[PDB]
């Protein structure tokens, strides 16, 4: 009160300095039943994948793809993600989640890069510049290697032009390189493009193939279908906490509900458009939303000349969490005895700390509100105020009390009639003698005209009020000497 009221002497009354807040604690996070299970097990656990003349541009849609199982698969060789990190792959997704599959030879996996051609990037599969998505290579030695070489994945090393990025290269006809045409029977310049990967068990680990799937992410004007999964906590109840459900969020208290939602909603609103109830998408249970409580501090003093003790009122707050509504562990031990103690009380206005309730009724001296006042009788007391003396004086149909003695006393009555006149000049108050600011201020039109004409009006009207209140006499009258 000494710092806020700009004094060292504070007169008896009620004062408001600050407020108090209760804080979120756990920051709970919920997501629905993710649980849709895209068919990626057949493109992660099969013994014969697609070919490089037949790598299908398959649309996997309307499910979810887990990528946290990919990091703990314990077999990956050249896990590559362009554009976005694979650490934040699972939480955030994009549209156009088209997928590819081939068992590429492991010698030139590193040539598949934006801005780098080769013979795998030139005749098998090319990545565009600024790729968003992942290309995922792993060791697959134990399954695609039969006796004498696994000749199941034929490939192309011969084609007319360079690859367009993400191009379906399917052909049976042969490469043209000379001028003499082929006659069906293969000749010296026929150049059959479909030769064989030799995938023998005697090959080295760089020579044994690296099995690639492509999680390409494009951006067209179509909504997304397949994303990564979402991890979710549990929900805490009857506590001020931050929440984040499936799209909607806030800070508040989750309690049990009593109203009946229809089976299609997930939340509710009220009059003037604020949320008040929510249904969780993993239990289908309606939970009421209560905001975290707050209020301002009201401090009661009988005057700095009189006492040094104070009384503290926390308004419209339940009087149990008032030490943990404040940061009583962070403040002084002086503030700690005004957060807990024997002298606790709950009023209709709120929780009062620093006074004891008195059953007796006295005259009100300090206005708190809702009938309770406080005073000092050497400790601070709390009491419901007394209206005055009761009177039941005897009604009689044939008796009158008539006074026979008289009192002459007078009563002061004070009213203010006038004001000290104050006017301001607008222009160099606003600018402070700047040429371009004054060229700005006349260019705000004529605000100075209404301003000076209204602030002349207070002075001239106050002059009329003084002229009315103190001139109702024609002359100057004088008393006898």
């Amino acid at each position, epitope marked *: 009160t000494k710092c806020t009221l700009k004094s060292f002497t504070v007169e008896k009354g009620i004062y408001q300095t600050s407020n108090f807040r209760v804080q979120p604690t756990e920051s709970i996070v919920r997501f629905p039943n993710i649980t849709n299970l895209c068919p990626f097990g057949e493109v992660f656990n099969a013994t014969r994948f697609a070919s490089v003349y037949a790598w299908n541009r398959k649309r996997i849609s309307n499910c979810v793809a887990d990528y946290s199982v990919l*990091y*703990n698969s*314990a077999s*990956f*060789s*050249t*896990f*590559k*993600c*362009y554009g976005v*990190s*694979p*650490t934040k792959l699972n939480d955030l997704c994009f549209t156009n989640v088209y997928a590819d599959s081939f068992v590429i030879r492991g010698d030139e996996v*590193r040539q598949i890069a934006p801005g780098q051609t080769g013979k795998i990037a030139d005749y098998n599969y090319k990545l565009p510049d600024d790729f968003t998505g992942c290309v995922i290579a792993w060791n697959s030695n134990n399954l695609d290697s039969k006796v004498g070489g696994n000749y199941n994945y034929l490939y192309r090393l011969f084609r007319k032009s360079n690859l367009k990025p993400f191009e379906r290269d399917i052909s049976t006809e042969i490469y043209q390189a000379g001028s003499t045409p082929c006659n069906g029977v293969e000749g010296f310049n026929c150049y059959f493009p479909l030769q064989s990967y030799g995938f023998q068990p005697t090959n080295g680990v*760089g020579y044994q193939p690296y099995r690639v799937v492509v999680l390409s992410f494009e951006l067209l004007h179509a909504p997304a279908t397949v994303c990564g999964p979402k991890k979710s906590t549990n929900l805490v109840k009857n506590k001020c906490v931050n929440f984040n459900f499936n799209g909607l969020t806030g800070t508040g208290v989750l309690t049990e509900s009593n109203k009946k939602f229809l089976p299609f909603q997930q939340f509710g609103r009220d009059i003037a458009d604020t949320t008040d109830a929510v249904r969780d998408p993993q239990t289908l249970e309606i939970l009421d939303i209560t905001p975290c409580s707050f209020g301002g501090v009201s401090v009661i003093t009988p005057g700095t000349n009189t006492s040094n003790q104070v009384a503290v009122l926390y308004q419209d707050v339940n009087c149990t969490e008032v030490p943990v509504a404040i940061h009583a562990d962070q403040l002084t031990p002086t503030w700690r005895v005004y957060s807990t103690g024997s002298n606790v009380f709950q009023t209709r206005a709120g929780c009062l700390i620093g006074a004891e309730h008195v059953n007796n009724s006295y005259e009100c001296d300090i206005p708190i509100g809702a009938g309770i006042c406080a005073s000092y009788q050497t400790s601070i007391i709390a009491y419901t105020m007394s209206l005055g003396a009761e009177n039941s004086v005897a009604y009689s149909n044939n008796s009158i009390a008539i006074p026979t003695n008289f009192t002459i006393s007078v009563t002061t009555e004070i009213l203010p009639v006038s004001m000290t006149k104050t006017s301001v000049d607008c222009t160099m108050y606003i600018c402070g003698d700047s040429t371009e600011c004054s060229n700005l201020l006349l260019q705000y039109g004529s605000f100075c005209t209404q301003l000076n004409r209204a602030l002349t009006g207070i002075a001239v009207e106050q002059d009329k009020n003084t002229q009315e209140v103190f001139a109702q006499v024609k002359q100057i009258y004088k008393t006898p000497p």
Partner: nanobody
């Protein structure tokens, strides 16, 4: 955004052990793959050891397998490389490298690496 300052080099005889440390400063949370490089005099810079910060999975080269190990210390944001059973074919400039683009084995020079300043490891 990733700066690497390493130490732990020095001189030791055959049969001894040293302990390389590479400290990371800056974007620690984007670092997902820590690889250790090695360039012999007259030979190309190759790969020795590898570590994933997300998974803890180690990829080891064939000439250092059974003798060389890598460990992660996230309290000091430092990666540790312990070289036991040293032989004089390991005398080379040892490099630590960080990746914010994923994990890839074997290590390749053409990839995007945040490099270290280099400590000389000498054994005879």
């Amino acid at each position: 955004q990733v700066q690497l300052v390493e130490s732990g080099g020095g001189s030791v005889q055959a049969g001894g052990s040293l302990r390389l440390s590479c400290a990371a400063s800056g974007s620690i949370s984007s670092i997902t793959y820590l690889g250790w490089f090695r360039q012999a005099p007259g030979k190309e810079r190759e790969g020795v050891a590898a570590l994933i910060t997300v998974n803890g999975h180690t990829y080891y080269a064939d000439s250092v397998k059974g003798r060389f190990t890598v460990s992660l210390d996230n309290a000091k944001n430092t990666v540790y490389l312990q070289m036991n059973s040293l032989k004089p074919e390991d005398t080379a400039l040892y490099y630590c490298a960080a990746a914010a683009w994923g994990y890839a084995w074997p290590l390749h020079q053409d990839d995007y690496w945040y490099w270290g300043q280099g400590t000389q490891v000498t054994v005879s």
